[PDB]
């Protein structure tokens, strides 16, 4: 087996299927994105970037949450295509493919979200907006509680100084996870996971000779992400049950349903 080639194939699939990557994001973040730092600039950005959503209107927090869900829906679609290009994934039982994506997509979403975040805010709307961390904190409860744990994760994740070649393999390892609930062919998935994790381990050795614990750091980040998602799903349920105007998109409803 050629591990260098598997890593390159996974990286190529990542560059092909995700609209945002860390190089693209850093170019934009270096300095164009419309800066959203208060309600006036939110409303201006909406009229330019999501005009249809404010041509009527819901509460600002509910409109923001709608844009959050639209982003997630788009990233789930990109993740599904990426997964179909992961060598070995397509040979799995279609039911197991669904299970792996169901439990993995939000872990992958929050891992990749780090690439568009800095300590002050995050890129949104296909790189055309930058919404500040302080503005998101300023929203009424419960909506101000959505993004802050994700910024906290991202600041430490970004301090690892990974590049897209690393992150692509990390996202592949997140998806190819043999302990998801309800898998049919656990044995085969575990062997697929072992293979991807082996490629990740060797890649980190080659790409980050300076950090001899980077691989176990990333295993821990995978566990951190599972907890982050469990907590995120709990908050989404609170929103679903107490916020009538915050309609949940059907693909995200099917992902969350019976998850944790």
């Amino acid at each position: 087996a050629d591990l260098k080639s598997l890593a390159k194939r996974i990286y190529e699939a990542y560059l092909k299927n995700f609209n945002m990557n860390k190089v693209k994001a850093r170019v934009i973040l270096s300095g164009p994105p419309f800066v959203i730092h208060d309600m006036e600039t939110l409303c201006m950005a909406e009229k330019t970037l999501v005009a249809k959503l404010v041509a009527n209107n819901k509460e600002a927090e509910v409109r923001i949450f709608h844009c959050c869900q639209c982003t997630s829906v788009e990233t789930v679609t990109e993740l599904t295509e990426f997964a179909k290009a992961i060598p070995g994934f397509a040979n799995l039982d279609l039911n197991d493919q669904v299970t792996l994506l169901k439990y993995g997509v939000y872990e992958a979403i929050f891992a990749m979200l780090s690439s568009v975040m800095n300590k002050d805010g995050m890129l949104v709307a296909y790189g055309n907006g930058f919404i500040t961390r302080e503005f998101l904190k300023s929203l009424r409860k419960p909506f101000c509680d959505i993004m802050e744990p994700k910024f906290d994760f991202a600041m430490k994740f970004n301090a690892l100084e990974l590049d897209d070649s690393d992150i692509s393999l990390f996202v592949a390892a997140i998806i190819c996870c043999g302990d998801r609930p309800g898998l049919l062919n656990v044995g085969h998935i575990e062997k697929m996971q072992e293979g991807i994790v082996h490629v990740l381990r060797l890649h980190l050795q080659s790409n980050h000779p300076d950090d001899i614990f980077l691989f176990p750091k990333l295993l821990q980040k995978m566990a951190d992400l599972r907890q982050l998602v469990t907590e995120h799903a709990q908050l989404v349920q609170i929103i679903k049950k107490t916020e009538s105007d915050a309609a949940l998109h059907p693909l995200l409803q099917e992902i969350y349903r019976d998850m944790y």
Binding site: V76, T77, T80, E81, K84, L94, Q97, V98, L101, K102, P250, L251, E254, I255, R257, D258
Partner: peptide, 10 residues
């Protein structure tokens, strides 16, 4: 039970 995901996967 995952009609959309199942469709996206096809």
């Amino acid at each position: 039970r995952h009609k959309i995901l199942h469709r996206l996967l096809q």
